[PDB]
Design a protein around this ligand. Sequence first.
Ligand code: HEM
Ligand code: HEM
Ligand code: CYN
Ligand code: CYN
Ligand code: MG
Ligand code: MG
Lengths: 298, 299
Amino acid sequence: QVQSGILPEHCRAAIWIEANLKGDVNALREASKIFVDNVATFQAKFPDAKLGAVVAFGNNVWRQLSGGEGADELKDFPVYGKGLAPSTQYDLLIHILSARHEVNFSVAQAALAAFGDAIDVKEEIHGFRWVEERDLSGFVDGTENPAGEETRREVAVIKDGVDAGGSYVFVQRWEHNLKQLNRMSVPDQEMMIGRTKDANEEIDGDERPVTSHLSRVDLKEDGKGLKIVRQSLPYGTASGTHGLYFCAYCARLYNIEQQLLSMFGDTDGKRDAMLRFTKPVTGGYYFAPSLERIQALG
Amino acid sequence: SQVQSGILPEHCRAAIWIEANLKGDVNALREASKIFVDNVATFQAKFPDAKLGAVVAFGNNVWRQLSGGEGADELKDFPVYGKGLAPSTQYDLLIHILSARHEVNFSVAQAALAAFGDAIDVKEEIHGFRWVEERDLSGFVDGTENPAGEETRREVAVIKDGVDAGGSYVFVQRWEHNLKQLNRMSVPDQEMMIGRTKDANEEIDGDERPVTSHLSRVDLKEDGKGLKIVRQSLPYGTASGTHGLYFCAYCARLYNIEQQLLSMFGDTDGKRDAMLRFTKPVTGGYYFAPSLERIQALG
Ligand code: HEM
Ligand code: HEM
Ligand SMILES: [C-]#N
Ligand SMILES: [C-]#N
Ligand SMILES: [Mg+2]
Ligand SMILES: [Mg+2]
């Protein structure tokens, strides 16, 4: 019932396509059914890839496709920090992940053939897992990410009601300035993140700044963690733009939004220390329906 | 007398090509090149699993300066072919990194940029990937008649004696495929354009295919001796944006490459390559890849 791209772990490569609807919204119903069938065909042809994919929709388009039923938290991605986090809300998100970039490329081509000229592609990002599963900053990223199908489903997948099997998606492309990062001593970079760089040990919450990344995003509400399932990957060229393509799934949009309000100064007026070397340049929220919901579109 | 590690490896799934111009004094390339080939050895020791190789190669103007004009007799700036059908974008430096792991290539590319620093102006950076069934994005298999095995690849690509022993000439040319235009062609018309069958990859006989077919343009012989080259090309791009083939070839003589270009672009017999119907070259450059010892001896 869940779309195949939400739960797989340790993907080596991904493709994210963000697009606007040019045509009639009804064009998305047949295209989405064709695409999920193409995904099943590619999984049968390349079982070693561990391929998964997700089709997700922006607020305006999803309200039309669903007739206003469910997806109660869905809204256009707002700016956070009064503009520190910009907003680039589009209508459609396609997320393709697997162990093989070449298979993702064929799947991306099938997605574009299915949607055709009904969409205007705004962004296409090719993610790759880097050496030692580190972010391009040199810090390991995924250590506290929910692990195993059971916990990932608990965090990411809606349990009951009309949206059972669905998930909320957040995508945000960051552009790293590695020259500005390298000007920082390793201990200063470690206090900025909240984990040691080489050994990847958590720095105690009482011993690191409240602006450290972990202090901004490891949030609890009366001891219950506001967890999310991250599928982010590094991207870019060595000589041009590079950074992290942030991607997260959650059964509630609330958990993601509380982390953004914290990181961008809206909650307590303090900003994530990572803003010293990297910045977000896109931002969008989407609703990922269940596979049964996609089949019930036409 | 040792060949640079990136020329001969076969079947590497990923590559990075960086093309750049020199901003200041040519001297800056001397230490940077030594640092970079040392970084390559360090990365091979750290990621023995990667099967990493790399090449540093130089354009005519900068190689004449670094070599004092000795050797590399065929080197010259890449000219236009077909009076402009093949454009020319000759730069000063080419860095080619290939391995079984794109992530390792990325670290090596960053080390190359750290070594050369602000002495260079990067003009192009292309990330190549091997596609499904080793096919070009056009859907045709690549590589079938490419020299195979170290022995033949060395014979074709590596200079055997003299001051340039262990070196090679490099040609790079980025093509932009129009897959929509290709898909308007029937499969039999695409097969006559290439000179091989599409699904089974069987050669169409030379007397049964047009003289404009790709194989008829580039499978050239001089009294029965093939003008062979070692190709290291890979597909590149985005599905929604620009994509195609990043053509890359190594040869012990620049002559073999040039005869194929004169043929493909209409200079030899007035006929051009049928692939121009759906794809076009947008860059072009020739470089000289010295042997590892000649790079170590830069100073
Ligand atoms: C430049 C952008 C970012 C970088 C480089 C980055 C990097 C990291 C690193 C290195 C970790 C620690 C390793 C781990 O446990 O996964 C981490 C953890 C985390 N990040 Fe980020 N991050 C970024 C943006 C974001 C954003 C935008 C969010 C949420 C909206 C976020 C949410 C999280 C969460 C929830 C954790 C786990 C915290 C915990 O429970 O320990 N990150 N990030
Ligand atoms: C869009 C650009 C190109 C495409 C799609 C392309 C495609 C192909 C294909 C499908 C083959 C047949 C399989 C094989 O034997 O490898 C081939 C062969 C070959 N291509 Fe290309 N090619 C391109 C450009 C070039 C260029 C620029 C050159 C040389 C300057 C070249 C030289 C060769 C050679 C020597 C062969 C082997 C011919 C033989 O001996 O049978 N190609 N190419
Ligand atoms: C954080 N990723
Ligand atoms: C030709 N490759
Ligand atoms: Mg924690
Ligand atoms: Mg032949």
